[PDB]
Structure formats: C-alpha cells, structure tokens
Write a protein that binds this DNA or RNA. Structure first.
Ligand SMILES: Nc1ccn([C@H]2C[C@H](O)[C@@H](COP(=O)(O)OP(=O)(O)OP(=O)(O)O)O2)c(=O)n1
Ligand SMILES: [Ca+2]
Length: 1108
DNA sequence: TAACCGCGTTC
DNA sequence: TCTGGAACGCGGTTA
C-alpha cells in the first residue's frame, strides 16, 4: 500500500546515493559448474572485503525483500551486491497428526499475503524425548517481502487471541476446528537482516567472492581491508551561560581527519582572521598536519564539508557524541540554508533519531566509551578518555570563551578544534575500529548496530546463531505478568540474593609496618595434609603438565612444609605483612560452565543446586486487596483522546491505580508499606540438556582469556626491559593498554551472558539459573575467606575477590623446573585455595554426547574455577564508617611497590559529579599514607594535609584566589530525566534546575542530562539544604539579575553583599570535609590504636566512650 | 530512627 | 522500540 511505495522509493534513493559514493550494484557472471569453495579461483566472481549490509527492496532486477552488501575490492575500489531471501516464520500446532489441516486453513486464510507453505521439523528443547531425536513439526510460512510477513501476523493474531479465550455457546447439550489447532507463531520477531546474516552465514569483516551461486568466504585473505576513515567535530556559537541552538546559533569551524590528513574549515563571518596551516602532534604516534579551508560564510563552509566528503568517499565517519549534537546541528544549519543533507552526502536520521547512511558507518566513539570502555562515568568525557586510552592531555577551553575567542584569539580556538579532531580519529583507529569490526565477524550485525546495541542483545544474537545452526527452535521473547502474588500479598518485586560483600578491617596497611597475626594451628595442619596433592594440582591442572617432568618437586614441597611448620609452632606473630589480592577469573561464567548452568537445563542426569529468593510484597492480604479494587471500580477516570471507568481502562493503568491505593492502605492499617522475605530454593539442573547455551559462554570466555593473557604476557615483557630503552618500554606499555582494553571490552559482553537470563524480553529466561550462580559464588568466596582468616587477616571481600594481608613468613611464590628447562610459576596462597575449590566444588556429573547417532552419553568431572593472585602491594587504605560497628565496602586505595596508584575504588574522586573540595582533598590525601616511618608517623603526615584543608575552610576560604574558590566549593550533579519528570521530589539538583530555568529560561531544562553546578547558601537559616542551593552561573551574570535572584533565593531583601564568599554556608562545607577526614583518617586511626591525629575533627560520641 | 529515593559506583 | 544482573555508599527527605 502506501507503506510499500515509501519503501520502494527509499530503495531508489539509496541506490542512487550508493552509486555516487562508488557502490554500483554488481551482478556476477554465470557458472553452470559445481559450487565448491575449493574451486573458488575458477568460479567467476568478484572478491571484496565486507564492510556493511542493509535490508532493501528489489523490483525484478510489489517489492522483493533482500539485503545489500557493501564491499571493498582488492584493486582499491568498491561495489555492492544484493542477496534476496524470502522472510519466514513458523506456526506451531497442538496436534501434529492434523498439521495438514492447519496447512489447508492458512493457505486460504493467508491467501492475500502468503507466498509458500512447507512442513519442517526443528528440535524443541521443551519437548519430551527431544534428547532422543523426537522433533517438533511446524508449518513454515514464507513471504515475498517483510510487509507481507507483517500482514500475516495481523491476520494470525485474532486466531491466537480467540483460541486463548473460551468458545461460544450454541447447543448446551453435546474433531476440533482447525483454527483452534494453531498453538502459536514462532520466530516471527527476528529482524530481517539478522535472518539473512544467520541463515546464509555472512559476516561483516570477512572476505567473500560474490559468485552467481552465492558468497564464498576466502579464508586465504586474512587481514582487514583499509577503509577510508574520517572523524569530524564541530564548534558553534553559544549565548553566554546557555546552550547552542541550531535555530539561531551558527557553526564556526569543522575539524576532521581523513586517514591522518588534518583539515579545518572556517566560517569567516564568525572567526575574525584567516587561519594558516599548523600542526598538532600531541604525541609522536599521532601525526596531525592540518590544512585550513577558509570560507566566506556558513553555506560556503557546509558545502566544503559535503564536497570533501563526496570526494574522498568515506566508508566510515567517526564522531564523539556526534549522534545527538554534531549531526543534528549540521542538519538544521543545512535546512535553514536550503541544503538537503541527504541528497548531499546520503546521511539522515533514523527511527531512533540517530544519524546513519547506507554506504558509511557512523562510528560514534561515545557509544563505545559508554558501553565497552569499562571507564567510570566521571571519566567518560573526551578529555578523560583521551587521557586514559591515548596517553596525553588534549587542549582545553572553557565553553563560555568559545564564542568570544572566535574574535579575540581565533588561532587559540583553532588549536582546540583540531585537538578534539586529533583525539577522535585516533580514538577510533586505535580502539573502536579494531574492536567493533572484529566483533562483526562473529555477530550477525553491521558495524552501526554492533556499536550501539545493548550487550544483552549482542548475547542473544550470538545465541540465536548457535540455536539456528543446531536446528533448535527459538523460544519466543519472555513476557512478565502484570501481577504476581506471594502468600496472598501482591508482589512489588522479586529477585535473588546476589553477591556477597564484607567489610572486615579498616586502616592503613603497608609492607614496611608490622602487623599482628594469630595463625590457627589446625589450619596449618590441614594445609600440611593437603600440601602433597595441592602441589600436584598446581602442576597437572593449573599448569597442564605432569609431575613426572618437574625436577624440584621435593625441594619446593620441603621449603613450603618448613615455612608452614614454623608458622604452626609460633601461632602469635608480629611481622611485616603481604598485601595480596585473590580473585576468581571470570567468576560467574566459570561457575555456569562448571555446573552446566543454562536456562533450558533448569527442570544422575539431575544436579540439585540451591539459590535464594527474595521478594518484596505489600502487607495487605487478599481480603484487603479486593476491597481497594472494587473501590476504584466505582470511580470515574479521565479519558486519553470525555471520561472512562476502571474496567474500561487497560490492565496496565488498572494496576497502576491499584498499586498507588494499595500503598496508602497498608501505610495506615499496617504502617509498613513493603515487606521483604527470603526463602531458600532448590532447582534441578539437567546435566544432559543440549548445551548450546553453555558452549556459547565457554567459547566467548575463551575469547576473552586470549586478550587477558596477552595483557599478562606484555606486563611481563615490560618488567624485563631496561629503563633506559625508552622506545621499547613505550611500545610495551602501549601493548598493555591495548590488550587490557580489549579484554575489558569483552568482559561486559561476557558477563552479560549471565545477566541475559533476567533481561526483559529474553528468549532464554531463568531466574533460578542466575540465583544459583550467585549463591554458589557466595559459598566459594566465603570458603576462601574461612581459610584466610585462619592463616592471615582478610581486609575486604566482594563477590569473588578477597583483599588480605599475610605474614611475611607465609609460603609465597615458587618455580617448578621442568626437564625441558622451562619453569612453572606457583603461588602457594592461590594454589591452597584452588585445591580446596577443586576438592569441594567440582561438578562430577557433567555429561556430553559420546555417540550422537546412538544417543550415548559419557560422564566426567568439570571445574574451571580458579583464583588468580595479584600483589604483593605496597599499601592498602580502607576507610571506616561514621557509625559504630559498621564498615565501608567497595572503597579503598592500593599502591604498588614503586609508589604508584594501583587501585582507587568507589571514592568521590572517581565518581561523576560530587563536591570538588572532597575530590581535590582525596587526590592529595591518599598518596600521603605512603610517608612516615611508623604507623603513628604515617598518620601524622596525613594530618598535615588534613589541617591545611581544614585551614582553608576555617578561614572562610580567604586563602584562595577567587578563581580557585569557584572551583573548589562547587558541586556538579547530573539529572537523568528532565526536571518536569521529578514532580513531588526535593533535592539539590532539582532546586538548581528550577532556578537555572527561572533565570536563564525554560529552554535550558528542555533536555535531560543537565549538569547542576550549585553551591549551598547559609541564607535561608535552619532551612532544608535542598532549598538553599544556588546555580553557580548566577555569580557570573550582570549585577541586577544577581541581586534579584539572590535576595529571592536567600529570602533577604536587605541583601547588597553579593560576594559568593559571604553567601556560602561555610559551616556546611566544613562539616562535609569533616566526614571525609573522619572516615578516611581519624576513625580508621582509632581502630588501629592511634590517638586522633586531626583533633580539630572531633570523634563521634560512641568512639569517645569506647576510648575510655 | 528507619524507610526510602537518585545517582554512580564495585562486583 | 529498545532494553544484561545485584550489592552498596551517601546526601537528603520523610513517616
Ligand atoms: N559488570 C559486571 C561486573 C561483574 N559482574 C558479576 C559477574 C562476574 O563474574 C562477577 C565478578 O566480577 P569481576 O569484576 O571479578 O569479573 P569477572 O570475574 O567476570 O572477571 P575477572 O576475571 O576480571 O575477575 O560479578 C557482572 O555481572 N557485571
Ligand atoms: Ca573475578
């Protein structure tokens, strides 16, 4: 209909644009010989590196469905080739002996849109006897295009919903109709291009030969082709204190880089003078020679950008958040200027509002930064990312100086624009491009989708490929019920008990300051009894060798035994510690694969595993619940298109009202509004189920292990280089960052296999399997702690890792020597626990198909759960709570032996936003715990820094320049949603957002993600802090505006002193600094037996009493 | 006091 | 239409 025409027309537009960019549709010659990959060089065709793919319509050259594929050929050119393929989904039946009856129904019922029918079989993991070869019979419906596939779904849903409802009433005194035989539709929601990419085993990033028969992968060709890559960034005018408006604000410059060649177009109507060619090579490996394009006016600028793009023909354009700032600005500045960007460069927004093209992938690096970098949110800006992954500081410029510096210091502003471009091209080439394009080789998505789709969706794609290739029927996307009940109470949420976290000790621990250890002598007895087989376990399992080939096994056994035996005779010791960290490698994935954990396996073929369920429900019983429902049934409610009734509403809106009224009732009759209960649960895990899910996790884990191991290889290569070989250590350090980043980008995707069984809309949902994963790790990590606390002092614990200190005389690291001369590394702290993990947690019931033809299985033991050890570290600093007895989890600082920071967890320094005074305070303070000869001398050095920070606040800031003051006292906080979505809520961010609007206009709060830079006033006295919160920007406006809003915000019309120094609630920030000093310095010092080093910060009353 | 929320962390 | 999980710290309101 009118949908077809729009789609056929779009295909014609896209076809013309592709040809302008060098993608003419290529048809390979004919061949009547056998189609075999071995004979690839003789089958006529064209070879090309696959760079993109998109669904389209074809007109015998109604529309025909197909997928365009974009190639770069070996002769420096490009072409595209199309594959047609009939879209299809399946109809399931509830009586396989009458499948033809249903077949003859839908042939006539779907005669308007059906192209062909077929009876096919697939394996159904929910079917009885499916592990014996019994398959489910289905009707495969096929169509000419996707719109016809959707037309059939619209005709098939009435049948499915009518069968779910009961039958009509005819003769009350009384072979079923074939319409009732339709059980369900299946695989109806697979995106078409994912369907073609899976069924035809085509992947972006591989080499193919487009022949008449099909696509032949050329395994001979190895390395990727080199696409023409461009990355650009723009700079716009901006009213002071406000945001750029693509309506009124013009753009001044566009800076970009094409394969290393730098460019910068300028808008002379805004920037004052012509800019000469200049260079920005921030580090030697980032060459940046920039040729300038000075143009009269904005149109002239935009056509250079469009003409240059048209001439170099980029197949990848990279930006940094250019999907929601840059591209929409260029578009609107092209609309006002009468330029159609789509006819110019083939770029346009899509359904999600992101800007895309047919021939060119848009690589928004911010998506990679946000999803795969593993960097914190505070470190996700371009400057922080450039500092972390590129190893240099890019040029800075306060955005309020950008519009003026187009006039005053243009060249200064030309160096900032090129900086953003240099950092973006090399961020893409070094990190984003290799990662995403490699991922495309195994994921049936094009580059644009591999970069932006959620990691759970990426997992589902990987799993569907396995499911299809093993002829397993795809389950339909899971749907959660609108209401669930527990014990007669309406549930508000349910979950499983997740990871185990423990705060066990606080204070400073350093390798030069002795500690007191109490060694359980029975513990040493157990280690001595397990020592012979633990060392064998290290040889044969941990290093995949044989004790027959090690030549110092007895020496090592004796040295460890001697060290252990002395520790037993002296169980009370005051020694230097060893600050060690043990962590299970890929904990949850390895827990899953060890126990054959997968959603379809939750049902000696049965392994019972326990998990913990936690529910949150209303205190109201049924008898009450029904009462509030019938109350709302008698009420009127507004329409949404002039008044409706409860039952005339939707089910969703119904329970929305029920929940609100249920909360109110319980808050009165019960006072409590939500009750939480935990119940232990068991689940059967079949050990014989088709392991397509488990095997997918095992493969992707092994994929990550590759890069994780290379990061450890090169960490050792760098430790072997002499400090004088400067060029060698830089290459080694660059390898370390590259592989550490690659293994980290694989980490989120990996652990998303564990999270996917709880994702909304998941095809393989199982709360039980996730709950079992969490409880098992909780058992292992506590088993490990139970041993550490008997031999040393565990400090902190989270999920699968333990930080601890061990006596200096505890057996540490050893090196088996093989007859080959090669050595094997052994760390006894790790091997003692790994022998226990493999004594108590191995799955002895793991099963695999031996003979698949006769369906014979074998049973073996499996366990891939290993602690890895890092250390020994120079220092660890763990903070303590302000409340008595409580600890602080997920926060500490760790230092390497050479004095550099190893880890910094949780603290405000790294968190996004937060109070700059506390941020800057933490930066200066942690490195100071390294000073001092004794523990008491250590705390004194930190107190010196403390009292300097207390001095600036006690002096009401009089010691800082007013520029350093506006930065130290400000606190930034982001707003996830728009301010209108926070109605009925008070906070400092909301107040700042409201006042920013009453002063700079509602056009500021128009967009979510607003940063609220505020300072708290002492002005409304004894008033809630959420009200005394002023936008920092007010101290930067003209004086009348400042006083009006100030006096109003202070409730003091007698206010003429508009100096920020007088408005600040110094006592508030003095108390904030106090809580920081208490938790990092003084209160941990008390738990370590050192009197308050910072007496100006008084101890809590409970601490002063315990001191006595 | 304890429940409770928003944000951004550690797993 | 998209869309991995739970545990936790902290400032701040609220019952
Ligand atoms: N983003 C994350 C981080 C962690 N986890 C869960 C699953 C992990 O198995 C477990 C432990 O977290 P780690 O940081 O130890 O991650 P891994 O054990 O997977 O990796 P590593 O080998 O680096 O320890 O926490 C998760 O689900 N999602
Ligand atoms: Ca781990």
């Amino acid at each position: 209909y009118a949908l077809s025409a729009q789609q056929l027309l779009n295909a014609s537009k896209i076809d013309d644009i592709d040809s302008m960019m060098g993608f003419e549709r290529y048809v390979p010659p004919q061949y009547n010989g056998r189609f075999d990959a071995k004979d690839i060089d003789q089958i006529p065709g064209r070879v090309g590196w696959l760079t993109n793919m998109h669904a389209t319509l074809v007109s015998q050259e109604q529309g025909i469905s197909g997928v365009d594929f974009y190639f770069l050929d070996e002769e420096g050119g490009s072409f595209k080739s199309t594959v047609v393929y009939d879209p299809y989904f399946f109809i399931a039946c509830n009586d396989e002996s009458r499948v033809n009856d249903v077949e003859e129904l839908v042939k006539k019922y779907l005669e308007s849109c059906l192209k062909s029918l077929q009876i096919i079989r697939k394996e159904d993991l929910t079917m009885d006897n499916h592990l014996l070869g019994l398959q489910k019979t289905l009707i495969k419906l096929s169509f000419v295009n996707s719109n016809q596939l959707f037309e059939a779904r619209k005709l098939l849903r009435p049948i499915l919903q009518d069968n779910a409802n009961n039958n009509v009433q005819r003769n009350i005194y009384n072979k079923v109709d074939a319409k009732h035989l339709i059980e369900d539709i299946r695989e109806y929601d697979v995106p078409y291009h994912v369907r073609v990419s899976i069924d035809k085993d085509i992947r972006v990033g591989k080499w193919y030969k487009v022949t008449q028969q099909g696509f032949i992968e050329d395994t001979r060709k190895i390395a990727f082709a080199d696409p023409v890559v461009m990355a650009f960034a723009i700079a716009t005018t901006k009213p002071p204190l406000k945001f750029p408006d693509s309506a009124v604000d013009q753009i001044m410059m566009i800076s970009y880089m094409i394969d290393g060649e730098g460019f910068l177009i300028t808008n002379r109507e805004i920037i004052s003078e012509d800019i000469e060619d200049f260079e920005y090579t921030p580090k030697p490996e980032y060459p940046g020679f920039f040729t300038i394009f000075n143009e009269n006016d904005e149109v002239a600028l935009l056509q250079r950008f469009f003409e240059h793009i048209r001439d170099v023909r980029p197949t990848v354009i990279s930006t940094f958040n250019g999907d929601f700032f840059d591209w929409p600005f260029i578009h609107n500045r092209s609309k006002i200027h009468g330029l159609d960007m789509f006819d110019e460069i083939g770029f346009a927004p899509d359904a999600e509002g992101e800007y895309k093209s047919s021939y060119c992938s848009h690589m928004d690096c911010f998506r990679w930064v946000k999803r795969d970098s593993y960097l914190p949110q505070g470190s996700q800006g371009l400057k922080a990312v450039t500092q972390s992954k590129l190893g240099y500081n890019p040029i800075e410029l306060d955005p309020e100086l950008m519009t003026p510096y187009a006039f005053e210091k243009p060249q200064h502003l030309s160096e900032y624009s090129v900086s953003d471009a240099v950092a973006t091209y090399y961020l893409y080439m070094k990190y984003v491009h290799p990662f995403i394009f490699s991922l495309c080789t195994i994921i049936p998505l094009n580059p644009d989708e591999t970069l932006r789709k959620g990691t759970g969706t990426l997992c589902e794609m990987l799993l569907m490929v396995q499911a299809y290739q093993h002829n397993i029927l795809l389950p339909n996307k899971h749907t959660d019920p609108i209401e669930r009940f527990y014990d007669g109470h309406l549930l508000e949420s349910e979950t499983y008990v997740g990871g185990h976290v423990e705060s066990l000790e606080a204070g400073v621990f350093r390798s030069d300051l002795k500690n007191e250890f109490k060694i359980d002598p029975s513990a040493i007895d157990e280690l001595l009894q397990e020592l012979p087989e633990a060392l064998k376990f290290s040889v044969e399992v941990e290093n995949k060798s044989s004790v027959d080939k090690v030549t110092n096994f007895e020496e090592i056994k004796n040295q460890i035994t001697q060290k252990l035996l002395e520790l037993k005779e002296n169980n009370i010791r005051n020694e230097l510690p060893l600050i060690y960290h043990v962590d299970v490698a890929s904990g949850y994935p390895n827990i899953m694969t060890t126990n054959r954990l997968q959603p379809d396996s939750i049902k000696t073929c049965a392994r019972k595993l326990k998990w913990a369920w936690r529910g949150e429900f209303f205190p109201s019983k049924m008898d009450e619940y029904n009462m509030i429902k019938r109350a709302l049934q008698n009420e009127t409610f507004p329409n949404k298109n002039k008044v409706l009734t409860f039952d005339e509403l939707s089910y969703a809106d119904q329970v929305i009202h029920i929940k609100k009224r249920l909360t109110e009732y319980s808050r009165k009759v019960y006072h409590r509004v939500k009750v939480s209960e935990i119940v232990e649960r068991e689940a059967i895990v079949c050990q014989r189920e088709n392991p397509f899910y488990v095997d997918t996790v095992k493969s992707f884990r092994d994929r990550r292990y590759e890069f994780k191991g290379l990061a450890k290889t090169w960490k050792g290569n760098l430790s072997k280089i002499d400090p004088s070989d400067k060029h060698a250590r830089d290459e080694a350090k660059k390898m370390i960052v590259l592989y550490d980043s690659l293994q980290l980008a694989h980490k989120v995707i990996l652990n998303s296999f564990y999270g996917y069984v709880m994702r909304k809309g998941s095809r393989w949902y199982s709360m039980e399997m996730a709950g079992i994963t969490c409880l098992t790790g909780a058992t292992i990590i506590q088993m490990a702690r139970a041993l550490v606390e008997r031999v040393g002092r565990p400090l902190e614990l989270d999920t699968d890792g333990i930080w601890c200190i061990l006596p200096k005389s505890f057996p540490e690291t050893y090196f088996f020597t093989l007859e080959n001369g090669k050595k094997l590394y052994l760390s006894y702290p790790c091997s003692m626990l790994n022998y226990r993990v493999h004594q108590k947690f191995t799955n002895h019931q793991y099963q695999e198909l031996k003979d698949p033809l006769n369906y014979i299985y074998e049973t073996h033991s499996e366990n891939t759960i290993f602690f890895e050890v890092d250390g020994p570290y120079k220092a660890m600093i763990l903070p303590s709570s302000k409340e008595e007895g409580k600890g602080i989890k997920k926060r500490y600082a760790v230092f390497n032996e050479d004095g550099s920071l190893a880890e910094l967890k949780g603290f405000e320094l790294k968190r996004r936003g937060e109070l700059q005074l506390i941020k800057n305070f933490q930066s200066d303070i942690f490195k100071v715990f390294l000073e001092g000869d004794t523990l008491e001398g250590c705390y004194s050095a930190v107190a010196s820094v403390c009292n300097r920070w207390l001095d600036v606040l006690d002096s009401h800031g009089l010691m800082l320049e007013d520029e350093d003051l506006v930065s130290l006292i400000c606190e930034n906080r982001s707003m996830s949603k728009t301010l209108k979505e926070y109605e009925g809520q008070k906070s400092t961010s909301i107040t700042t957002a409201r006042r920013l609007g009453d002063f700079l206009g509602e056009d500021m709060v128009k967009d979510k993600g607003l940063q609220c830079k505020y300072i708290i006033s002492s002005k409304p006295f004894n008033a809630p802090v959420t009200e005394r919160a002023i936008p920092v920007a007010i101290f930067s406006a003209d004086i009348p505006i400042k006083r009006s809003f100030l006096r109003r915000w202070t409730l003091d019309p007698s206010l003429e002193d508009l100096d920020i120094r007088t408005i600040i609630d110094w006592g508030y920030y003095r108390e904030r600094l106090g809580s920081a000093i208490q938790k990092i310095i003084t209160i941990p010092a008390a738990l370590q037996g050192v009197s308050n080093p910072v007496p100006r910060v008084e101890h809590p009353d409970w601490l002063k009493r315990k001191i006595a």
